[PDB]
Structure formats: structure tokens, C-alpha cells
Amino acid sequence: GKGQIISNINACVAVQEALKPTLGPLGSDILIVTSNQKTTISNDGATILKLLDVVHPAAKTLVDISRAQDAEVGDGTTSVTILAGELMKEAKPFLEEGISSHLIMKGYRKAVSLAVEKINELAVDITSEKSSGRELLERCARTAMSSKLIHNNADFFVKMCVDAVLSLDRNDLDDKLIGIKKIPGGAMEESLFINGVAFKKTFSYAGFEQQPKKFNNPKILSLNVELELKAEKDNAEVRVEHVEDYQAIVDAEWQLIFEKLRQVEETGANIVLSKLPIGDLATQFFADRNIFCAGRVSADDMNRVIQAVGGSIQSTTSDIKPEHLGTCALFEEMQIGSERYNLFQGCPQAKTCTLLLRGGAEQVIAEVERSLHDAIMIVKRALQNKLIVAGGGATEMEVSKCLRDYSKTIAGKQQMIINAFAKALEVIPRQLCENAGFDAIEILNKLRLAHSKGEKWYGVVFETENIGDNFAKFVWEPALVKINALNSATEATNLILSVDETITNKG
């Protein structure tokens, strides 16, 4: 019946209400408690919404469009869910007066055809004009770091952010290629950029391992299985018919491993890593040969080492071929972070890097880790996509303007629908002001003054509350966000409003 349509609209409001404070870098965060009891807190709407698992069928549409938003684009997963839900809230009083849903849903796609042609007119392609290679990455890095605790220390952080993307291919860039590990303790300005990978220092036990950490050209080799003798967990029982034979029972592993001890010496590999915990048998012979090794290496850490020197993993140490080996330029393990952490430097073939951060608490670094990801996604989409538009409410306020004038020239019921479509676009700049504390009543009223003077670049200043231009604030967003969001929000809005019945089978 008709009552199912209204019930489906209010069901999405409860999900949308939680995603409203998550819009913007300064907005509130959602605390989600998984059934596994692991607590995760982040401002990225993708991972957030994926943890809800709402039983309601129409709420699954928001999850489906969130995956395509994070895959094809990666930015704006929160805004695409709020914009798709806002159109359903404004259409609630229109359905109570007898207006069919088909006319309202059809009117939304009418403004989409005018929105696609509007984005192409607002897209300006500029690369080397009034800019350079270093000035492009430097000016855009301080924008995402503004209004944060790192703004005073951002001078040293921008220099490390520019060299991060230069170490990787400009045609193909991935934000996951730069790792960030939380290191408790130390100053936040003492962090450095490393091309290699670091470990967690999981060994708190003392009494061995003397060795200098300064190496010239170590050789890297991967080992798929654990080679060890001493084991802290399990144990071996020996019962036989002879008294003097109790010793030799546990020695069955000697000969074949005894030969493998000198195979590394003949090979010369100075780096040995494995995804399984390694005992003290491997660390024994490696001392004199100046061979470095680390046990209990994560699975994701070895995959980054394979792509570093171009080597490959092998099960045993016998049949390893010479092309599996690799060598870096320098290996230096310093005390940065008040603990010795191994790292690689000088790998020309390395397809990934790691950006280390320091701070007095792990929660402070977590706020910086999510803030650095926003600056990477801007550069990630500024390379492949040459169309750059003014974001932060600039383009959002421009789309609503022109659509109000196009409705006056369109006779019929589409006039109120397009006018309501442009009116619902005001939720994006509003919520951004409420999350930062600014008053959305006065700004949205005063912004419409200069907005009608013909200048389409007027944005919203995120630092000090006032009307201004995002061109001077260096707030940029790719044109792919505005194109993919309007197409996904319109399809998701027309899908839920057309539901006349909710069928759920139990058993």
C-alpha cells in the first residue's frame, strides 16, 4: 500500500542521521561496536556504513552505491549517501497530496541531464599554467592540514608529502602503497619518510643479538616456511627401550637443516624474512655473516618486500635460483621513535613505501593518519583526471542556482520538482557549517548575495567563518566526484521511493 512508501523513507533517515556528522574533516565520528568486539573509529564513511548491515532492504542500496563510490572514485562516500537521502525527505510531503511517485522520480532525472552539461562548463583543465611541479603539491598539501593540530608542524610535513608521490608512478597511483604505523612516544615533528618497510618490535626478551646495524649492500631473500629448532610453545616427548637413546630421538631435524645453515653463507643473502615465527636457530649463524633477519612478519609486509627488489618467494633454501635475490642501496636501523625499527632505503624498483608517524599517544596519530589520506586522494585523482573543479561547497552552490532558473522555463509539474531538487542541494553546505560550528542560517543567506553576481567560483572558507573564494583557499576536488555522485544518488533515490511493498521471508 501507500503506507509502505512513507515507512521506507523514515527508515533511511535513521541511517542518514548518523552519517550527517561524519561529513567533513572536522565532523563527528560514529562509534561502531562489531560482534567481534573490535572497536574501530574513523571518519571515512565507506568502512562505517559497511559495518551497519541493516536488515532493511532499501538500506542495502546505500551500501551498494558506497562500494562503487569508494572503488571508482574513493572520495565523497559520506556526501553521496546524504544527497541520495535528502531527496527522499523533501519528497515526503509531496506524496501526501496525491502526487504519484513516478512523476517525482522522473523529474529528478530531468535535472541530471542539465547537471552533466553544467559540470563540463565548470571543469577547467590547467596543469603547467601559473603553477609548477613542486608548487602544485606544496600549496595543495597545506589545505588538508589546515584547522588541525599539525598546522604548526605542517612545514616539515609538506616536504615529506611531495616526495611520497614522486617515488611512485604518476600514471598509476594507489593510496594503499604508502603505509602508516603508529609509534607511541616522541615528538610529532621528528618523523621521516622511508621507502622501505618497518616492523613492530615484538620481542621484549633480552640477552642476545649483539650486532651493528650499519650495512653496505644487504641481499634480500624470502622464505615461505619456518626453519627453527628452539620452540617456546610445543615440546617433544621421548619414550624408548634404551636409556642412552633418549637424546637422539629429537634430533631428526638436524642433518637437512645443518646443511641449510651454510647454504645461506654460499648464497650471501643478508635479509631473511618469513611469515611464521622463527626461533633462535636462524639468528645464530647470521651473526658473523652480518645477516639481518626479523621473525613474526605479517603477511601484508612480505608482499611489499617482493615488489621492492623484484624478488620472489621460495619454499626451501635448496632450489632458490639467483634471480630471486635482491639488493637495496642502504640499510640503516635508527632509534627514531625511541625504539630500533628496521627499514629499507634506496630501492629504485620499489613499488611501495611507508610513512612513519610519531606522537605522544596512538589516538593522536590516528587523527593524523586519516588526515594524510585526504591529501593523497586529491593528488591521486589530480593526475589521471585532468578536469579539476572548485569544491568545498563552491560547485554545490552553483548547481542549485542555475536549476532554479531552468524550472521557470519548464511548464508542468516538473517546475516544483526541479525547484525542490535544487533546494535539497543546500544540505551539503549546511551540514559542513554545523559540523565545524559555524552558523548555517546566516552564511547560506549571505552567500546567495554575491553568488548571483555572475562569479561561479565562490566557496565556503573552512578556517574563519565568512564568505570567500576556494581558489585562494586552494580547496580543489576532481570532476569525477560530481559526475559519479549525481548519477548514483539519483538512481538510489528513485529505487527506494518506488517500493510499494517490503517482503521478508522467515525460516
Added chain:
Amino acid sequence: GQIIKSIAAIRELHQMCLTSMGPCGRNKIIVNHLGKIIITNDAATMLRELDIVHPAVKVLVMATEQQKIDMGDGTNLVMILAGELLNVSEKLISMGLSAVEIIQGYNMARKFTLKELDEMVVGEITDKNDKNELLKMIKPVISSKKYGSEDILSELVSEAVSHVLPVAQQAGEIPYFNVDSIRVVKIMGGSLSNSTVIKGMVFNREPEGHVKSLSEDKKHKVAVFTCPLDIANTETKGTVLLHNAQEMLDFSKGEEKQIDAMMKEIADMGVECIVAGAGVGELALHYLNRYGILVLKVPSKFELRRLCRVCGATPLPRLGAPTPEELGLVETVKTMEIGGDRVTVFKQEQGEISRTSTIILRGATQNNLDDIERAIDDGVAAVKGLMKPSGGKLLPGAGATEIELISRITKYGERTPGLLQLAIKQFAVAFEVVPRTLAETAGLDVNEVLPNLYAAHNVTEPGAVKTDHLYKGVDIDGESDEGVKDIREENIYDMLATKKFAINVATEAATTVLSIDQIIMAKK
């Protein structure tokens, strides 16, 4: 008054189907008890996932399945029309007219309608199987299901049909087009504009070997081996075991020389493709890489049936006997990247015309991905309706058929004296639900579009010969219009085999409900 409450129970499910037919239709999400979500726009498939309690509704469900099995199209016309026949008969039962003459009245009105279907034929399908000629039949099938995709999906479906059909004319003895000749596959990524048409089955799995694709040589030999790859041993038990290390060297080298000897004889016969329905060992993939033999594994027995009708291959119960008589021939096989992942497809060039084709779908929406998959299946049965049983004849659709029948039935009402006039008049009024449904769901006013439909088919012409436009149907508008418009502009027509078959099923559907005055059931 149980017969009245039985209609009210169907009325609760009647409004569900009123929102199905037409461009406003939407699929329904159904969560199975096993944790699987099946999404389809088709009503006949939807009834299979729904649990029907009252057996009175099962009569309409069983009548709906009849439309999907034979003609495959028109399931929405059968359920909606049969539900309206009970509403117009509710007034006759309350008026005091017995249900006996009501059933007898439908039998007389059904024979009068079937005789007029031959005079309502506008065009005649020549069965040319041309790409442009198939656009007229496929367009209304895709219509009233998914909006905006009717232009793109029209060229994809019509192209795959012409590939599986041979060159023949005026021959109805030997059937050609089957219902399994068109398979629909889905893959994540892409769009509708980048979709292509493949002349054969599409395999989305990995080749599981270092050989990506075969060469360009003509007439590649393909052999299907049901027996797994392994050394020949006793059929009963025959498990390989090692008692001592001495027999290890003989058993290990024995399996390597036996498999290599069988692959050498097959490679010499010219067979570049080996299809193994069972698992493949580790040592078997090493020899196939050096000989340049494509590795293909099809565990599903349903896919091997359609493969035998293309190249002509036959499954062999044994291994190592490459009989050249049962081998198949394919012109060209290639491995290309479609949808973001590299897969090995199956197609042809000229000879060995394939009787089975597969259309690849691409898109960024998961919900609409399965919608087109279920929508093409309704278009597959439309080609089957082109055979001898009134395949060439067609009737105008878009609500123009149900409105035109009103004037013809009411003319024969006053001609037949007696009490049959009550059932004949109500039989024509029941056709008014079709034009009202499209106008109500689309937001059009009833006081505007509906009176213009009656004035379109009823005019005053000073002469016996009809003139002006009789093709005006129900218009969905969507932009602007005054009154209605001609349907011949968009070329939306309905086949006679689909409409004539839907009338007989819908007539017997409402006949069963009205004839049952008592229902006795027990708990399970």
C-alpha cells in the same frame, strides 16, 4: 459470503501486480531462509520465490506459470486480467445473478473474441531475421521493465539471435531456435555502451595454465574428456601407496611417462584444446604447457550439452583414445580482457555455425545487473513465438488492444438475446483496467487521459469505411503532450501468439474461482 472474501484475498495481491506491468514496475527483494537474495522483475519468477497460502491464489499462480513455459511472455497480462474478471463478477453475484450463467457467458464471449483477432492484424512479420526487423519485436518486451535501456539492449539481443539462426525461409518442419540458445552472463565493471555480442558461450573463469590462447589456425580441434587425468589403473579401488622407498622411483617416473605418452598422441592428431570435466593433476598441467594445449575445465554437465551442438565434440568415457570422428571443430578461439579481467571466450568466424550464443553484460550497478539478466530471458521466448502458430501476425499494443475490443464486444451484446447480455457487457468493461493502470501509475489524471481513449476509437465518420487513426493507444507521456499519440511512431506491437494464448488462460483462471462455492482444508 466466502466467495466474496476470496476475491478480497486476491485483491490484496492484485494491487501488487498493478504496480508491476508498465514502466513503473520494480523488482522485489526476497530474502530466502538460506541467506540468499534473489532479485527479479518478472512476475512468474517472483511467484516461485513467494510462499502462497490460500489455494485460491494458487489457481492464478498455476495459470501464470503456463504463460511462462509456453509463450514465455505476457505473464502480467494473465494475472491482471484474471483478477479484474472477479471484480466485475462480484457485482453480478451481489445483484442475484447465479454464477452458472456467468461462466456460460464467458464461454460465448471468448469465442467471439478469438474470431476477431484475425481481423485486427496490422502488420505481418516476414521472418527475415534482420537486425533492423528484430528491433520491432524486442522493443516492447524490454519496455515496461527497465527504462532507458531499451535503446542499448535492442541491438545486443537482436544481434545474438541472428548468429544462432541458419539461412532458411518458408520451412516450418524442422525447428531451429530453442530456449537455451541464448545465455546471459554478468561481470563487475563496465557500462552498457561497451557491451558486445559473442557468437558462442563465454567462460569467465581462469585457464589455469601458462597458455593464454591458441593460434589463428583454422578449424581448431576440441576434445571433451570426462575421465580425469591420471595413470590408468583398476577401476575398483586402485589407490597408489608406497610401502618402501625403492618403489617410489618406479611409481613416480611411471606416472610421468604414461601421461606424457598419451598427450603426445593427442597433440599429433591436431587437437589444441582438451576439455576435462573432472579435476586435473599437478603433473598434467606441465606437459600441456609445452605442447601449446589450452587448459579448460567444465565441471558443470549442463554446459557440455550446448557445446556438442556447436563444434560437434562428444564426451569420451575413457582417456587416451582421440577418435577423429567425434572431435569438434571451431574456427577461432581467443583470450581477451572484457570487464577488467582477462578471460577465455568462445566464438566462431564462418564455418561451424554456432547454435548457442552468449551476451556479455557490463555495468557499475549490482541491482540493475541481475535485472537485465532476467529481462533478456523474457525476450528469448519472443523469438520462439515466430514459428508457424501465428508467428507473423501482430496486434497493436500499449493498451490499444484492450480498448478496441470494448466496441466490438458491446456490439455483439445486444445481438444475442437472453440473460447472456449481463456477462457479455461486464466482459468488455473488465478490459478497462489495463488503460487505467498505465495512467494511474504514471501520474496521469483519470479525468483527462481516460476520456480521450474512448474518443480515439469511437468517432463519427460519414461513411462505412473506417478512417483517421485507429492505432492510438495509452501514452505514458514523460515530457508533454495533448491527449494521446499514435503508437505506430514508436512501432510498439504485440504478437498474436502471445495475446491469443493469454486470453484462453485468463478465461479459465477466473472460471475456476467463480465455480468453487466451498473450500475445505485441514492443518498440516
Added chain:
Amino acid sequence: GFFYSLAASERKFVDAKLKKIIDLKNEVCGMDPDKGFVIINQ
């Protein structure tokens, strides 16, 4: 099963009856047009 690197034992009983049936079509009803021969073979 019979694996050759044998089939005469399986076709020994089949060919004995088959060769005697095909001789009936040539000797009886061979010349007569518009006729046929059907085997039940349960």
C-alpha cells in the same frame, strides 16, 4: 574395464545377434517400398 595401450569380448554377443537381424531386411521386405522394420529391444 578394458583399457588398451579387448573390445571383442563385449561385442561378441552383440555382433552375433546384430548380423542376423540385418540379413532379415535384405532377404525379407527388401524390395517392397513404403515399409519399415522396428526393433523393440526392452
